[PDB]
């Protein structure tokens, strides 16, 4: 459940990220792979080294999916249906891994938006990421 305040906070913050969306997504992934090495086993076929074009490429897809969910915050289940099907059914992603990636995305934003990452904005983004994660794990 996202409040009208959360929704504006998340929009604001994504507004501030602007065109760095893809880049921050990639950085979030690298943070995840380094801090939580078990996550890497879902990407055996990626090169996960720093500067990897595949990681960069993937961070852009992840950031686009997040923006699509912000853009349709009121109907995320529908917006994210294909993706939740991919993650639960085909990929078999452990739900715990969503918490880890969510955390790294918050860390990334904190590291890049000193003014924007207030306690209230932190809380709103955490809720948004949790809602996205809920949708993405809803199809088991």
């Amino acid at each position: 459940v996202l409040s009208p305040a959360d929704k504006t906070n998340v929009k604001a913050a994504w507004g501030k990220v602007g065109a760095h969306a893809g880049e921050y997504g990639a950085e979030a992934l690298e943070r995840m792979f380094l801090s939580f090495p078990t996550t890497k086993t879902y990407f055996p076929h990626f090169d996960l080294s720093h500067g990897s074009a595949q990681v960069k490429g993937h961070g852009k897809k992840v950031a686009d999916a997040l923006t699509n969910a912000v853009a349709h915050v009121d109907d995320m289940p529908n917006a994210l249906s294909a993706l939740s099907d991919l993650h639960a059914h085909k990929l078999r992603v452990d739900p715990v891994n969503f918490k880890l990636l969510s955390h790294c995305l918050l860390v990334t934003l904190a590291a890049h938006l000193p003014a924007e990452f207030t306690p209230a904005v932190h809380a709103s983004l955490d809720k948004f990421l949790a809602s996205v994660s809920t949708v993405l794990t809803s199809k088991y």
Partner: protein
Amino acid sequence: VHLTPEEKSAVTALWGKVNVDEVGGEALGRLLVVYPWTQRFFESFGDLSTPDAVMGNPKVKAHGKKVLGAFSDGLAHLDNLKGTFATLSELHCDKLHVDPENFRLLGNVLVCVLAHHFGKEFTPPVQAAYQKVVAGVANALAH
């Protein structure tokens, strides 16, 4: 917490730059804001009805100091966290009855606060070393 020399290097260098009077209060404050159930162990601390309230609240900052105080200790005794945090364990566990998951949350909030303060300096490898530390500390507290 089995830190490599480079992990210790990264943790130590950054930590000397930390304002120990403020970061602890920021971390605890953010915990109570982002994860509101945690306010339940702190109803004695006063006005928590808003972020600004929590953030700008003296009992919060005060306690955060100790918390961060305790964390700096663990940073000195990386090779023996269980022994270091033996006293605090039997407090949050036996006296306060806090769930271990909440230590993980505080650690992650701390990490977000470090990222906030250090920006670009809080690199992915630096973050990874700090996750090892907060994990070790959380486990020692859980024991």
